[PDB]
Amino acid sequence: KGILPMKESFKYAYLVLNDLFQEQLQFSIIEPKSATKEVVKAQPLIGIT
Amino acid sequence: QVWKPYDFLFPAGRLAKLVKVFDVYFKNFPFSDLLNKLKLTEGYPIVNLIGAAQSNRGKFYAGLARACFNSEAIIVDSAIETGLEPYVIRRDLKLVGVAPENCVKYPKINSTYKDPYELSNGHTHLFLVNDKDKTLQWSQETLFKIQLILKLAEGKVSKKGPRCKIVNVLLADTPNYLDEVRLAVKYDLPIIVCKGSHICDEIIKNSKAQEEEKQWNLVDDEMQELLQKGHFYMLDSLDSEDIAQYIHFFLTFTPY
Numbered sequence: 001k002g003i004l005p006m007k008e009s010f011k012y013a014y015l016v017l018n019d020l021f022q023e024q025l026q027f028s029i030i031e032p033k034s035a036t037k038e039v040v041k042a043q044p045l046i047g048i049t
Numbered sequence: 050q051v052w053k054p055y056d057f058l059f060p061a062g063r064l065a066k067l068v069k070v071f072d073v074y075f076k077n078f079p080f081s082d083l084l085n086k087l088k089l090t091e092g093y094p095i096v097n098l099i100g101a102a103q104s105n106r107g108k109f110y111a112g113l114a115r116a117c118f119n120s121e122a123i124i125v126d127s128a129i130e131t132g133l134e135p136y137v138i139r140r141d142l143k144l145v146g147v148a149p150e151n152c153v154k155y156p157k158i159n160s161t162y163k164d165p166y167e168l169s170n171g172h173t174h175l176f177l178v179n180d181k182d183k184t185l186q187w188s189q190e191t192l193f194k195i196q197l198i199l200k201l202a203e204g205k206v207s208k209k210g211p212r213c214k215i216v217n218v219l220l221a222d223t224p225n226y227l228d229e230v231r232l233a234v235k236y237d238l239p240i241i242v243c244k245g246s247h248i249c250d251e252i253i254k255n256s257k258a259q260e261e262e263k264q265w266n267l268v269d270d271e272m273q274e275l276l277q278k279g280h281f282y283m284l285d286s287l288d289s290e291d292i293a294q295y296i297h298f299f300l301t302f303t304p305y
Contacts, residue, residue: 004294031293
């Protein structure tokens with residue numbers, strides 16, 4: 001969302017650190033954020049008779 | 050004896066360690082012996098809450114407690130109810146309260162009415178500070194609180210290493226924040242200004258405003274000078290993930 005008031009230099013340093021931790025330790029220092037996607041699915045009009 | 054430890058049982062609550070300090074102005078206070086007796090001998094990351102009181106920040110405190118759990122950080126506050134307590138209890142976090150003994154009340158057993166200055170269940174360690182005359186007021190404990198925080202972050206002198214990181218979280222839900230901010234700036238400690246109090250909301254709003262549009266109605270002139278001299282970071286969010294990310298960042302890295 002661009003809400004973190006961070007200098008770009010620190011943003012790149014943090015990403016490089018995260019990639020290093022993900023390769024070496026299989027862990028991310030970045031917290032996962034949820035992305036909600038509206039999907040349109042088909043449902044049959046089963047008549048509630 | 051300048052201090053005396055006790056076991057303190059909260060009514061319907063957890064067992065805490067309570068330490069009475071009989072003279073807060075005692076020269077060379079023996080923090081090493083105190084912390085050894087409490088088994089607080091490792092270096093811990095510290096999150097210091099400045100002006101913590103009861104507030105509508107529920108989910109924000111859940112995020113703060115999560116970041117403190119993942120970093121093994123000790124939370125330090127003013128020993129009164131804040132709304133952090135449920136998250137601290139569930140995660141077995143160390144919550145350290147520092148208050149003047151005369152300004153806080155002991156919780157009553159089966160009391161239908163909670164006093165806002167009652168000691169809150171969830172504190173694992175309580176430091177009740179006194180002067181010789183037992184006349185200590187709020188803000189007068191602040192020097193002891195910061196010296197305790199610095200010693201908790203250093204740990205045992207035999208561990209040749211840098212102290213653990215300390216971050217201050219300015220909540221300003223109480224008006225008595227100024228002396229603690231003055232000391233935090235003096236020790237070159239980072240301060241996160243968190244949304245949700247009138248004082249913090251004014252600071253955040255003025256940090257985004259151009260200099261000509263700055264309106265200070267609640268913030269004293271001394272605090273305006275401290276904002277220019279100290280390392281202040283504005284958090285314009287009450288989201289649990291945003292505060293967790295800020296705390297985790299400042300406990301791991303010093304950006305200045």
